[PDB]
Design a protein around this nucleic acid. Structure first.
Ligand SMILES: O=P(O)(O)O[C@H]1[C@H](OP(=O)(O)O)[C@@H](OP(=O)(O)O)[C@H](OP(=O)(O)O)[C@@H](OP(=O)(O)O)[C@H]1OP(=O)(O)O
Lengths: 335, 211, 62, 150, 83, 69, 67
RNA sequence: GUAUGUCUAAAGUUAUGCUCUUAUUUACUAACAA
RNA sequence: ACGAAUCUCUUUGCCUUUUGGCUUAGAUCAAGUGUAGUAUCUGUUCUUU
């Protein structure tokens, strides 16, 4: 025991030295100082490992003393979302059968998207190569591919673990999740299908920005126009006072509980899809020789994950606005 | 032929992987992958994690354990990695159990031979090269001796050339004593002993000469 | 008496060694304090859903 | 002259202020040495305490020794009498090996000990001005004799 | 067992191996010629060689007794297995 | 092959070594002299009304949050 | 660091010439080497210590081995 | 193709189950050709 | 039978050829041919044991 103690101490000292050094470096990098290319890569590595350690410690914490969400809160959320769809007459998205005229078309989109990664970079990794091969085969055997996908969705709730890395934007290093190609196709197709179905069924109300089919500057312009076109908005005569509130939903994806998320999805889509998606977020996150089961927290770097995030965003939006004001903003369900 | 990796785990292959893992450990998955001509790094590591690692278990679940499982399913919906961890089992197996509850050789031999060859060859090129040079050096030495000896037999005495000294202060240890750190000065007298040992030495030299 | 340290990372000499001695920890068991709350949560969801469902059917029948 | 009366790393030494001597530490034993002749002066009662990191002596013959155990020792420099043990505390988050006093020194006064511990803490120690021979005496000194150095 | 005990115990042994079967000083030179029996020193030499030889052959036997790759590893796994 | 440090290069040998008599940069006389001392609408919502661990510091978690996205 | 010296010389040339070529046209035929020469002298003054050290050490190494 | 590392570069120190024949693989290597 | 010596084995003790750093696991895992060599293959025949 004494030796174990001593070594624990000394690595804590060393660890302390490391972490602080890393922190110093990152501030240095932000400043834009003279720093070694090699040194910056080293710092990126250290900070990644540090991040992973932090993250999985948070997972442990979550496990060790229950979910952050109070069950009452969860219930309330459920009630809200239920109320919302009730008001909408929103028919849920089915599990996709062999019925579709669009099926092939949908598939073609996902493949195209995937191909977009590979058209530029001619020299490719092994994983990349595999993915490419899969894509090629899929083009060859569309119906068969579709069938395979369907089978996977029905069955597969344990996936290959997701490798990660950090792309180095020298302010803020960004995590890059790398799903194993076979599941990736599934993720793509599912995602595309979900978007087509969601937009077709009017899931996401107008007010959600990023997905609108309008350009971010265009979006901004539209917002400005809206602001102007409000009825007598600029008056300061009769004590009229406007306030604009920008804020960031901090860790909006990074603390989505799968249980709650699963149930939420089971509102909007066929439960099997929900089950799949929930099971996909629950992966083993390998990074550089350290792993952990991602027990609590959505992974942005799945293909469909965006949809999930958006759907979760809807919940938050509803909470903010309430049923009534949200209802107004959406308008009547029919028109 | 070069190609994209995958396929199915043949038992021999599995065994090889296990051996590799014993050798290189659970975080050098590239090397282990390389050892297997068919299977990838990622594939390999996954396999080890999922099926092959002995600190997993595939024993059936007790009724209590079944209850724990299905209760977990009820409570954690299809987060099977988490569920697996809770169980203390690997996840695929758990899922399968849950589901149940609810209701050529030349090539192989090539890689084997190569494998065994590798595992029994555990030195960087520096080492191999060094031993090679050592044996070569030895050979050279004996050849030189054979010449020298031959000449002696022939009647021409040739002194063996020194090692071409690498630096100015390079030492030959037969010239004179290495760094004669003498014994501690004599309390008890040592004179006769000195004589006897000297005689023994000289006698030994004589013997060698005669030998 | 310290055990001969063997790694999961780096053999210098390339000595193969037993798999138990290689990989360890063996402490995933916990499972108990982690669950306290999850039951309440998932149960809550189940009950909430039930309430919604019966409510929905009721209102529908109007 | 070369004193060698130590089994282990002699890794904490201190000059006495008004005596002209120097205490030294080993893994356990803490000799105190008279450096005029180059002679020993006094073995101490450090028989079970840890590896001594630092060993600052006070003005008033109050030899300090800092444990890798974490336990602050306190000796009468003249005799060797371990007149106080004090198991240190760590900061809330620390681990139990980290509470290790790695540095120490007294002021000019001798009424404030300062200790550089590995808990990233700089702990300081007063002598109790409320103390007497009946209110907190020493640790009832006893030379052990069990094949001992005294 | 400490090296304290193992010394005295080995001392006791070689005393059983014994149990089987003058000083002149020139103080100016400091040379303390202890003229002693030359036959006994020879008997020490032969006995001490024999003791070391017996031990030397003892390892040789134990080396020739028998999850590894090379000579060293086999022993290294044996160093792990003894625990 | 390539090995950890155990018995340091002890300045015994460097002492018995001969002088070089080179003039290094910093041994040029800097600071020659010494110093000395003296001596309605808000109702309708759903919800209407230190640690010594470098990996668990508030600063640290916050920092990580900042520098990841 | 001799760039400073070089730069100084350039500056001098620029100064000198345009006080030397007021009514006079362009061309190469100006002399007047004084201030530049001064610059170079001061550069040498600066460096004489540096070269005494540097070449000192150099020839020492040539003679005595390196430390 | 290199770092780099060895090698040579001449004068005589006075003592009495196998052998075989082949064809094929695979691997590695190759400033050799394509 | 006790004492001793010699030999062999077994139990323990001794580890007796018994892991000798650090970094971003230090980093990244391929698209080749024919010509030659080298080794390794496998067959292939016969000889005699
Ligand atoms: O300004 P610099 O790059 O140092 O070059 C100058 C400059 O030439 P540019 O103007 O073409 O650069 C001078 O030209 P003016 O400005 O005086 O017209 C010229 O001086 P002269 O006209 O007196 O010749 C002089 O040339 P020189 O060195 O022959 O005096 C020449 O310097 P470089 O020849 O070194 O470029």
């Amino acid at each position: 025991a004494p030796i174990k103690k001593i070594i624990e101490r000394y690595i804590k000292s060393k660890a302390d030295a490391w972490v602080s050094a890393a922190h110093y470096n990152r501030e240095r990098i932000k400043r834009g100082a003279h720093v070694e290319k090699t040194m910056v890569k080293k710092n990126l590595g250290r900070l990644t490992r540090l991040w992973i350690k932090n993250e999985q410690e948070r997972q442990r914490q979550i496990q060790k003393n229950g979910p952050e969400i109070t069950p009452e809160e969860a219930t309330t959320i459920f009630s809200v979302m239920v109320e919302w769809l009730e008001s909408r007459s929103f028919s849920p998205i089915p599990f996709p059968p062999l019925t579709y005229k669009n099926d092939t078309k949908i598939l073609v989109l996902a493949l195209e998207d995937l191909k977009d990664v590979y058209a530029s970079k001619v020299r490719l990794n092994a994983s990349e190569r595999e993915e490419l091969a899969l894509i090629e085969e899929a083009y060859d055997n569309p119906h068969d591919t579709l069938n395979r996908i369907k089978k996977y969705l029905l069955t597969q709730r344990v996936f290959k673990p997701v490798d990660i890395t950090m792309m180095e934007n020298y302010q803020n290093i960004s995590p890059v999740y790398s799903v194993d190609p076979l599941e990736k196709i599934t993720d793509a197709y599912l995602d595309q299908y979900l978007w087509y179905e969601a937009d077709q069924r009017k899931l996401f109300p107008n007010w959600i920005k990023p997905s609108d089919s309008e350009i971010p500057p265009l979006l901004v312009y539209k917002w400005t126009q809206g602001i102007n076109n409000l009825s007598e908005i600029w008056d300061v005569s009769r004590g009229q006072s406007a306030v604009l509130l920008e804020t960031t939903l901090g860790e909006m994806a990074e603390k989505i509980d799968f249980t709650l998320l699963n149930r939420l999805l089971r509102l909007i889509v066929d439960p099997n899809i929900a089950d799949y998606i929930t099971a996909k977020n629950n992966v083993v996150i390998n990074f550089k020789d350290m792993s952990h089961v991602n027990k609590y927290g959505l992974i942005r770097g799945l293909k469909f994950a965006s949809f999930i995030f958006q759907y979760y965003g809807l919940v938050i939006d509803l909470l903010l606005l309430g049923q009534e004001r949200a209802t107004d903003l959406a308008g009547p369900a029919n028109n | 032929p070069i190609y994209v990796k995958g396929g199915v785990w043949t038992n021999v292959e599995d065994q090889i992987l296990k051996a590799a893992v014993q050798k290189y450990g659970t975080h050098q998955w590239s090397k282990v992958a390389s050892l297997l001509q068919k299977k990838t790094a990622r594939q390999s590591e996954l396999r080890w994690n999922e099926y092959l690692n002995p600190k997993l278990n595939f024993t059936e679940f007790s009724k209590e354990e079944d209850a724990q499982l299905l209760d977990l399913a009820r409570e954690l919906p299809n987060q099977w990695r988490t569920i697996a961890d809770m169980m203390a089992r690997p996840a695929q197996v758990c899922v399968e159990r849950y589901n149940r509850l609810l209701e050529l050789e030349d090539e192989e031999k090539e890689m084997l031979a190569e494998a065994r060859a590798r595992l029994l060859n555990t030195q960087g090129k520096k080492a191999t090269r060094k031993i090679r040079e050592r044996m070569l050096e030895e050979s050279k030495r004996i050849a030189e001796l054979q010449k020298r000896r031959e000449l002696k037999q022939a009647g021409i005495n040739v002194a063996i050339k020194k090692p071409k000294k690498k630096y100015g202060t390079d030492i030959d240890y037969n010239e004179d004593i290495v760094y004669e750190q003498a014994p501690m000065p004599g309390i008890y007298d040592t004179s006769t002993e000195d004589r006897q040992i000297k005689k023994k030495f000289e006698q030994f030299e004589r013997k060698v000469n005669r030998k | 008496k310290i055990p001969a340290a063997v790694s999961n990372w780096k053999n210098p000499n390339g000595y193969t060694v037993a798999l138990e001695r290689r990989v360890g920890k063996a402490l995933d068991n916990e499972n108990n304090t982690i669950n306290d709350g999850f039951m309440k949560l998932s149960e809550a969801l189940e009950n909430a859903d039930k309430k919604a469902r019966q409510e929905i059917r009721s209102k529908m029948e109007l | 002259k070369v004193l060698t009366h130590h089994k282990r790393s002699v890794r904490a030494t201190a000059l006495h202020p008004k005596e002209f001597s120097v205490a030294s530490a080993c893994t356990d034993d803490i000799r105190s040495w008279g450096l005029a002749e180059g002679s020993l002066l006094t073995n101490f009662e450090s028989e079970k305490t840890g590896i001594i990191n630092t060993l600052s002596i006070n003005q008033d013959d109050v030899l300090f020794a800092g444990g890798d155990n974490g336990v602050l020792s306190f000796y009468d420099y003249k005799s060797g009498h371990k007149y106080q043990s004090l198991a240190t505390r760590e900061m809330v988050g620390s681990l139990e090996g980290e509470r290790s006093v790695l540095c120490s020194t007294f002021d000019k006064t001798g009424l404030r000990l300062i200790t550089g511990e590995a808990d990233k803490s700089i702990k300081i120690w007063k002598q109790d001005e409320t103390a007497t021979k009946e209110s907190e005496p020493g640790l009832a000194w006893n030379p052990n004799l069990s094949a001992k150095r005294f | 067992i400490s090296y304290d005990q193992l010394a005295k115990l080995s001392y006791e042994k070689t005393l059983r191996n014994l149990a089987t079967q003058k000083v002149q000083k020139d103080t100016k030179t400091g040379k303390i010629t202890i003229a002693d029996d030359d036959k006994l020193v020879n008997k020490l030499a032969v006995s001490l060689q024999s003791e070391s030889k017996k031990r030397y052959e003892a390892r040789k036997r134990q080396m020739q007794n028998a999850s590894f790759i090379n000579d060293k590893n086999k022993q290294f796994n044996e160093k792990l297995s003894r625990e | 092959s390539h090995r950890p440090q155990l018995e340091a290069r002890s300045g015994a040998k460097a002492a018995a070594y001969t002088p070089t008599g080179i003039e290094h940069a910093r041994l040029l006389p800097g600071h020659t002299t010494l110093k000395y001392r003296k001596f309605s609408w808000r109702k309708g919502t759903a919800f209407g009304r230190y640690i010594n661990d470098m990996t668990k510091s508030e600063y640290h978690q916050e920092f990580l949050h900042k520098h990841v996205r | 660091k001799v760039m400073h010296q070089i730069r100084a010389c350039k500056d001098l040339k620029h100064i000198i010439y345009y006080k030397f070529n007021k009514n006079l046209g362009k061309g190469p035929g100006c002399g007047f080497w004084q201030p530049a020469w001064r610059v170079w002298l001061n550069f040498l003054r600066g460096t004489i210590p540096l070269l005494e050290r540097y070449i000192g050490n150099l020839i020492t190494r040539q003679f005595e081995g390196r430390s």
